[PDB]
Design a protein around this ligand. Structure first.
Ligand SMILES: C[C@H](Cc1nc(NCc2ccco2)nc2ccc(Cl)cc12)C(=O)NO
Ligand SMILES: C[C@H](Cc1nc(NCc2ccco2)nc2ccc(Cl)cc12)C(=O)NO
Ligand SMILES: [Zn+2]
Ligand SMILES: [Zn+2]
Length: 339
């Protein structure tokens, strides 16, 4: 059964609702981005129109093998008409191809669905500007004040400096980055750039990256592993056992592994410059707080600027405590800002 926060009232639209079979009355299924908690259910057998970004559409076609006739890519920042309703897709500053969706309902109501997003002041100068929003479907992943993490730029600075120093001190070190979903590509791309290397990865991950419209991607990535000194591995292999196993593979070409795990928020107190790795012998593992979701302060600033009349959270909605906590913050933001 489809939850209410995945339905757009007054329309036949759903958002990120693919695991509920045929949704009654749904004439168009929107997919905000290609993350498994959002596309769950989509396959080559789906026979309804899917609306999404071009990049999401590339991934649906190539990775899930959804039939081309059902994939409806839309350009960003462009007023489009879907089933008689004006819609706009906006960059969500999440992962590649991730969008927010503006729905202009026939009765005059305007709904913004953020999908997953990392709120940024640059969004205050999109089609959102001076646009009255009556309903906001908000990515509330980190809607609590203890959720602080650095900017992505600060985290990348730390990663680049850490890797460059280690490989300059030891030209025989290998850098490993953990990955599962799309997103956070800047971690491995920026490290490989400072090391003058391409990023080596499996065929499956290479295929995924080829769908992302990344400029000059063929100059940056490869499936030739031992010709690269930055390797991608599944996130579950980023441990001492899995990295010890990987060090054998390259045939004694490397004698040290520096690995990066680009987590979300963790309870770690410490500043970005003072992050230290887990080390066992010649293997060190850095957990870096590279987030593609809003910090609390980023979320608060975005909502207080947008001044929506009603907020519908789309994350952390499963407990009375979580729902009550988020509503208390929404009220605090509204009282402080005056809307
Ligand atoms: C990598 C996967 C996907 C995943 N699952 C969950 N929990 C839900 C869950 C666990 C098992 C099935 O469904 N939370 C995640 C949080 C961040 C990220 Cl990146 C991925 C997450 C995983 O961890 N388990 O399958
Ligand atoms: C890439 C993530 C994948 C993901 N993240 C989350 N929480 C947000 C979170 C925690 C740590 C990093 O990011 N929860 C999931 C639960 C189930 C599954 Cl399968 C995937 C999940 C995303 O942005 N997905 O949209
Ligand atoms: Zn996501
Ligand atoms: Zn998500």
């Amino acid at each position: 059964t489809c939850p209410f926060y995945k339905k757009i009232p007054g329309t036949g639209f759903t958002v990120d609702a693919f695991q509920y079979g045929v949704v009654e009355g749904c004439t168009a299924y929107f997919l905000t981005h290609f993350h498994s908690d959002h596309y769950a259910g989509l396959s080559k057998h789906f026979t309804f129109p899917v609306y999404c970004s071009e990049i999401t559409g590339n991934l649906l076609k190539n990775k899930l093998h959804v039939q081309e006739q059902y994939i409806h890519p839309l350009p960003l920042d462009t007023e489009c008409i879907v089933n008689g309703v004006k819609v706009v897709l906006l960059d969500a500053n999440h992962c590649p191809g991730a969008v927010m969706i503006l729905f202009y309902l026939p009765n005059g109501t305007v709904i913004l669905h953020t999908g997953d997003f990392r709120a940024d002041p640059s969004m205050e100068r999109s089609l959102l500007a001076d646009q009255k929003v009556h309903m906001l479907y908000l990515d509330t992943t980190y809607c609590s004040p203890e959720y602080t993490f650095p900017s992505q730029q600060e985290v990348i600075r730390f990663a680049i400096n850490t890797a460059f120093e280690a490989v300059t001190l030891n030209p025989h070190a290998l850098v490993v980055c953990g990955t599962y979903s799309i997103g956070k590509e800047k971690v491995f791309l920026a490290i490989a750039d400072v090391l003058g290397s391409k990023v080596g990865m499996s065929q499956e991950k290479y295929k995924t990256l080829q769908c992302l419209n990344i400029p000059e991607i063929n100059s940056l990535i490869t499936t030739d592993m031992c010709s690269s000194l930055v390797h991608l591995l599944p996130m579950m292999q980023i441990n001492f056992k899995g990295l010890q196993s990987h060090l054998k593979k390259c045939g004694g070409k490397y004698n040290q592994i520096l690995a990066f795990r680009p987590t979300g928020w963790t309870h770690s107190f410490t500043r970005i410059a003072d992050v230290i790795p887990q080390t066992k012998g010649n293997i060190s593992i850095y957990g870096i707080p590279y987030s593609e979701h809003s910090s609390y302060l980023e979320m608060k600033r975005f909502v207080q600027w947008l001044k929506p009349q009603k907020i519908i959270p789309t994350v952390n909605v499963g407990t009375w405590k979580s729902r009550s906590t988020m509503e208390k913050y929404f009220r605090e933001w509204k009282l402080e800002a005056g809307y």
